[PDB]
Structures are given as C-alpha cells and as structure tokens.
C-alpha cells in the first residue's frame, strides 16, 4: 500500500524486518596501538565504540550483530577477537580476508583499457599526451597476480580501503554474515542506540543517513538501510567503484550509485531528496 515519489517517480516503502541484522564496521591501519589482549578497536570516552557495538548487541539480543575488520591483526588480538565473540551470543566477527568478495571483482587491465579508450576518442589535438603516456605505462607494468581491483585495495591502509570495502560489505548484505534475514542495517561505531529498533521502512528498501545539524543537511554514508544483497542503488554504486583505478577521496561511488538510481542530478531538489532517503530513527542518536 504505502508508496512514496521523488521526481516524479513513485516507489514503494519496503520493509526491513526485524531479524535483519546490524552491521559495524573497523579497519584498522595500526594494530600496535593497543596493549596486550585488548580487542583491536578504538574504545575511548571520545569514541566509545567498542562499548556501542556492545550496547547494541545487548539492546538487539534477537539480531546477528556483526563487527566487520581488517587489518594485520597479531594472533592475541584475533585471540581477544574470539573472546568478544564467546561473551556475547549475538556478536560474530566478520574478517575481510575470510569474506568472498570475488563476484564484485574487476581486471585492473580491464579498468585500464576502458579509461585509455575514452582518451583516444577525442580530437586529434585536445587530447591528454601526458596521462594516456601514464596509464598505458601502468597498463604494461600489472602482473597478472595482481591483476584485481579487490586485490589493490586490500592492501591500501587509509579511508579508501574502509570504503571500498564497506561499499562491497553494503552489497553483500546479510549474506556477510554467511537466524538472520537477507537485508543488513549498516552503522557507525559512534551511534548510540537507546532501545529497539523494531520494523523499518525504506523507499525501494535503501534509506542513508542523513545529518541536520548546524541548519545543514548533508546525506552521510555513517549509517546505510538496505532490504536485500546486491541492491540495485548499490550496483549504480559498484559501476562507478569499477571505472576508476585509484578514485579520488570524495569521489563517493556508493552516494553516485545511489542518487543515480533514484534520478537525483545535480539540478533536483537536494532538500526533498534528503527528505525522501533518510534513515532516521527515535532510538539510534546518530
């Protein structure tokens, strides 16, 4: 019954139901950082999150919660990792490496060979002579080892390898945690849940956050809703992740698939179309 439009377009409200599971993410560039037997996340009074990702599983004790990681973890950390798991009936670690990605996988020669191709085709003497003599020169030097877009990125360190992945995770969906149902509820360590979340609803089942302070309103990546793995927004998502080879910091390939998929231009009304995505709840404080 109940629908909502945006640009002239109407889409159905699809429910995220109560036994879809909550998905956190950490990557963690510096394992060192933390003393012996400690579990590998950040858990200060400024960013609590460790203690969040807890809180939520408590409060959610009929949802899968699930703590998403990478980085170069040392036996005890993956020690006191299990530990976490064992305290808590409802938390499951969730390591990238452990993850099959390779459905959401791309040649980097096939990434390369698109990009030159567009370069050739302009004119004559408007053309870039410097970077198709940079991309044909990092076109020769790819091994066929390396010749994967997943592969680049699981050995980046900074926000890029925490998006790239979390944007592969988002696709996935509950099919990460591989009861729980097929949609995943995707949020920061820094949210707070007060109580319940109980039965959700999304247009065409994404919904983003979206932050309204300081009279501002900015879609953020911090908290994703989706219904079901390999959504289609998410795929717009995953055709831009794949046309680039290292996509520059706020280039947002998983904001691009989303507005794409729901005819947001840059010429709509940015206000209504943050009215119409919105993942806001009374008990997350966000």
Not at 5 to 22: C, N
Not at 257 to 263: P, Q, R
Request: proline share 3%; aromatic share 12%.
């Amino acid at each position: 019954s109940q629908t909502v439009s945006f640009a002239g377009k109407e889409y159905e409200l699809k429910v995220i139901d109560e036994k879809t599971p909550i998905l956190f993410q950490w990557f963690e560039p510096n394992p060192e950082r933390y003393k012996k037997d400690e579990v590998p996340i950040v858990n200060t009074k400024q960013h609590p999150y460790l203690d969040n990702v807890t809180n939520a599983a408590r409060i959610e004790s009929d949802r899968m919660i699930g703590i998403f990681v990478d980085g170069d973890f040392s036996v005890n950390q993956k020690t006191a990792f299990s530990k976490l798991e064992r305290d808590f009936e409802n938390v499951m670690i969730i390591y990238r490496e452990d993850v099959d990605f390779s459905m959401y996988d791309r040649k980097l020669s096939d990434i390369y060979h698109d990009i030159i191709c567009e370069q050739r085709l302009r004119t004559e003497d408007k053309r870039d002579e410097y970077l198709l003599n940079l991309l044909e020169k990092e076109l020769r030097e790819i091994s066929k080892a390396q010749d994967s877009l997943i592969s680049m990125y699981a050995k980046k360190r900074n926000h890029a390898w925490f998006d790239f992945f979390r944007n592969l995770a988002l696709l996935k969906a509950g099919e990460i945690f591989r009861s729980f149902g097929e949609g995943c509820i995707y949020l920061d360590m820094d949210m707070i849940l007060t109580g319940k979340l109980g039965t959700i609803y999304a247009p065409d089942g994404i919904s983003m956050h979206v932050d309204r302070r300081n009279d501002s309103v900015n879609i953020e990546n911090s908290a994703i809703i989706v219904n079901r793995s390999n959504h289609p927004a998410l795929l717009e998502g995953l055709s831009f992740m794949h046309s680039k080879v290292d996509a520059h910091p706020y280039y947002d390939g998983l904001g691009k698939g989303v507005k794409k998929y729901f005819n947001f231009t840059p010429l709509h009304n940015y206000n209504h179309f943050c009215d119409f995505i919105e993942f806001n709840h009374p008990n997350i404080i966000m």
